[PDB]
């Protein structure tokens, strides 16, 4: 753990390029790394999620937001990005309660406005295809 | 690739302890990142083949001593490992040749004089059940 500087960020901003960069298999092994640097920092599950999400692993992907989110139980964006795995896997139900608990972790706070409209868009099309 | 500093040596020595005290799925993610922070490096190939190897995932490992071989073709634990590996899977005639070549890029040098020994002992494993 403490062998290192901060060079975490430098590893971090290193793998969340690769991540803009489309390179997620590289990201994912840095995001790993890091993970076992500082197994306390939730930008690094997060990212890692990021990462499985994006190449379609969802299992992985909702294993890593929920690592992170003991780490981070006040973090939106955990249960949100886990409910949108949910959603892959064609398990609304899981995936509805994953975004009401989004929903009340962001309450209306103007910096997740953005992703508050996501919650509520997500949340009608389950709502629409569930009441019938 | 250089958004880094020998930090390559911090991360290394770690994942090398890791390795030493058994933590071989920590070491793996550590080796597996230095493998994309400068993926020319054979040492960071030989450690991830063998914690690969120390988990007995042993044709991942021999894919990661094949991959560090083309980064340095004069070394002889990429052949000598992938044998003990094709070994363990039970393929003798292959791990006799991985051995043939490791001698022969031992060349009697000192330097190597204990992994000969394990080399003649295991060609020699070999060869009395392979003659009858």
């Given at each position: 753990n403490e062998i290192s500087s901060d060079t975490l960020e430098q590893l971090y901003s290193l793998a969340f390029n690769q991540y803009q960069s489309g390179k997620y298999e590289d990201a994912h092994k840095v995001f790993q790394a890091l993970c076992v640097l500082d197994h306390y920092d939730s930008r690094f599950f997060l990212g890692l999620g990021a990462c499985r999400?994006?190449?379609?692993?969802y299992d992985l992907?909702?294993?890593?937001?929920?690592?992170?989110?003991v780490m981070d139980i006040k973090e939106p964006r955990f249960p949100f990005h886990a409910a949108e795995c949910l959603l892959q896997k064609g398990e609304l139900a899981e995936a509805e309660s994953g975004?009401?608990?989004?929903?009340?972790?962001?309450a209306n706070k103007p910096e997740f406005k953005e992703l508050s409209t996501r919650?509520?868009?997500?949340?009608?099309?389950?709502?629409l295809k569930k009441e019938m």
């Open positions: 999400q994006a190449m379609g692993q992907a909702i294993h890593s937001y929920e690592e992170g989110a975004l009401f608990l989004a929903q009340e972790l962001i919650v509520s868009s997500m949340l009608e099309a389950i709502k």
